[PDB]
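Subject line: Sequence and fold of a protein, written as structure tokens
Enclosed: The protein record, placed directly beneath this head.
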Amino acid sequence: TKSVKRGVAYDVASPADLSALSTGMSWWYNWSPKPHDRLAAYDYAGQYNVDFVPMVWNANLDDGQLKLYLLAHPGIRYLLVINEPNLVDQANMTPQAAAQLWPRLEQISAQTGVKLVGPAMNWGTMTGYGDPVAWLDAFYAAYASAHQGRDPQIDYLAFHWYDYGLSSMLDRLSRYGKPFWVTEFANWHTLDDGLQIDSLEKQKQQMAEMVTMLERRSDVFRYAWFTGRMTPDPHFSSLLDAEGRLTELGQYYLSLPYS
């Protein structure tokens, strides 16, 4: 038994890594429409009690291939859409470009039953749209313009955050009246102010604070820690080390209480 909210943002490739994660982790995603090819002939849901959630990263979408996959995996009830549109190095989609895509996503929702989770917002780099509120206001106005004043279908907003104040950013984004998935988080504060996360204890402290807060929010359905492994790892953000082995952080993550 474990939290339905608790996930990882990582392209899990190894069944051994699922053995390690699955004691506390309910789900994962890999920024892509299908799991890693290594897992194709493994019943991961039945053996590890984990689910994979597909994602449409940007407008480069093979609608037919995704529909075919979702319809044959009716256990999949959610589709993550649009990875950080206001970041030029990520989805890099203007409000209009996202409005133009959206009916294709709504069609996939009607044809398969999946709820749309996204766009996945952060503080951005796109000219004029650093503030996710400015980007989302514009996306809502663009979509409503094209559809006789109807709002875009948003079942859940998604959010990524690598700093203090995650609860304050969710409060600010509540103005849309939508619940959230927080699909990337960790604390990567770096500036020399006393708050820099420059030790494992400090990442463990901030993981406990953030996880407790996300577990206790009724408007947060799922979250995903960033990430399984990375190198270099200056904030000690990795949950995994050797194939099939947790780090101290990973063991700690899986042990945390939940609602």
